[PDB]
Amino acid sequence: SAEKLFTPLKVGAVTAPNRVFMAPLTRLRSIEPGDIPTPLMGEYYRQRASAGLIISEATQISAQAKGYAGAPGLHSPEQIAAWKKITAGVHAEDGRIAVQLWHTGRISHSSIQPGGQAPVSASALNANTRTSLRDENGNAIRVDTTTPRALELDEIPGIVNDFRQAVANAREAGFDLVELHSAHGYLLHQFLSPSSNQRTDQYGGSVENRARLVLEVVDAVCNEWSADRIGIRVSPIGTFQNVDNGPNEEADALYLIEELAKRGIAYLHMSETDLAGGKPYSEAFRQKVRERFHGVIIGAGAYTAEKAEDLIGKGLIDAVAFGRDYIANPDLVARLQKKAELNPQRPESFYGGGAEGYTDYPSL
Ligand SMILES: Cc1cc2nc3c(=O)[nH]c(=O)nc-3n(C[C@H](O)[C@H](O)[C@H](O)COP(=O)(O)O)c2cc1C
Ligand SMILES: CC(=O)[C@H]1CC[C@H]2[C@@H]3CCC4=CC(=O)CC[C@]4(C)[C@H]3CC[C@]12C
């Protein structure tokens, strides 16, 4: 019955009854205008409430933070009230839910920015990737990213404050935890990576400078709420949507994790590979990470149940977040526990659209 995946784990302020977590999954089904979570999104999360922990789809800390049409926010009264219904649904089913908070920075498009203006980043370099907009019929469509404007020095306190306010908002909205999105090429990662950061002020150059913004954010949100409410997702090894981690990625990663550990936060979520591939982590590196962080460590990235049991049993990580298996299997915990087959995935309905391919996938 898989030896440890179905055992409890204390995760900061809450207790997970198992180690099968639901990874954050952008599904781009919110209401526009307003970027408002929907009853349908509430149903989808409720279906998945047996997860050890649900991590929400990435959610905007501000309107500026928006980079995808259909991604929800957590900055407006309308958004807060909608999220309250979703977390109540999950709690009604005895689940736990964390909100993943992002600023997309240069992975964005001017047509969805305030005033229709260019999006912001550490430097004025195009992301050279695609984001998702909606066409005149409300259907998801790919679009090249807009070239960003470099944040001015005196704009950085505002960014930190947006993260702080969004965490305040998450508390009022009834989330159990927050997850800072410091991975996959979005704004915090844009500062972290030399490839996307050519600043010559104290937010660029050395690893200390590059990690300055994310650590400022971590301190602000710990002070706003509590360290045992804060998780962070990083992707510090490999390349993610054209953003790599520099020529000293392993040393820089360990620096960051040591700094994070100083804040005593609830967890560290390691996204190990991009959807395209990535070189696998070495056991030695996992050991170096493990010895530097004293909260929960969550592993993610094309994990199998077997891999998750291997590494939890090795004491290298405490939980695993599954993404696409959770899209297709609301009761993934029960399936894994019973070694039942999984529903087939339907990737064409991962983004945008409605119930089909969303609340679609049956339970046992
Ligand atoms: C449709 C889709 C949406 C995603 N959305 C997010 C997101 O909002 N935040 C994030 O950190 N990662 C995101 N990802 C990465 C997932 O959280 C997960 O780390 C990659 O799915 C995990 O692997 P697996 O799906 O093979 O289990 C997404 C991946 C897919 C396929
Ligand atoms: C190349 C393309 O279609 C884009 C449009 C939507 C984007 C996905 C949007 C959600 C997302 C958030 C993440 O944190 C990891 C990258 C992903 C998973 C994105 C990868 C690139 C995709 C799939």
List the helices and strands and how they pair.
Elements: E1 9-11, E2 14-16, E3 20-22, H1 39-47, E4 54-60, H2 77-92, E5 97-102, E6 120-121, E7 130-134, E8 140-144, E9 149-150, H3 156-173, E10 177-182, H4 187-192, H5 207-210, H6 212-224, E11 230-234, H7 249-262, E12 267-271, H8 283-290, E13 296-300, H9 305-313, E14 319-322, H10 324-328, H11 332-338
Parallel strand pairs: 3-14, 4-5, 5-10, 6-9, 10-11, 11-12, 12-13, 13-14
Antiparallel strand pairs: 1-2, 7-8
Helix pairs in contact: 1-2, 2-3, 3-6
Bound molecules: flavin mononucleotide and progesterone (STR).
Flavin mononucleotide binds next to strand 4 and helix 10.
CATH architectural designation: Alpha-Beta Barrel
Beta-strand percentage? Answer: 15-25%
Backbone structural class: alpha/beta
In spatial order, strands of the major sheet run: 3-14-13-12-11-10-5-4
Tell me the name of the CATH class.
Alpha Beta
What compounds sit in this structure? flavin mononucleotide, progesterone
Instruction: Please give the largest β-sheet.
Output: 8 strands, parallel
Number of helices: 11
- Tell me the span between the first and last alpha carbons: 17 Å
| Overall domain count | 1
CATH topology-level name: TIM Barrel
Shape: globular
Order of helices and strands: EEEHEHEEEEEHEHHHEHEHEHEHH
CATH superfamily: Aldolase class I
* Cα radius of gyration in angstroms: 19 Å
> Considering DSSP H and I runs of 4 or more, what fraction of the residues is helical?
25-40%
Number of DSSP-assigned strands: 14
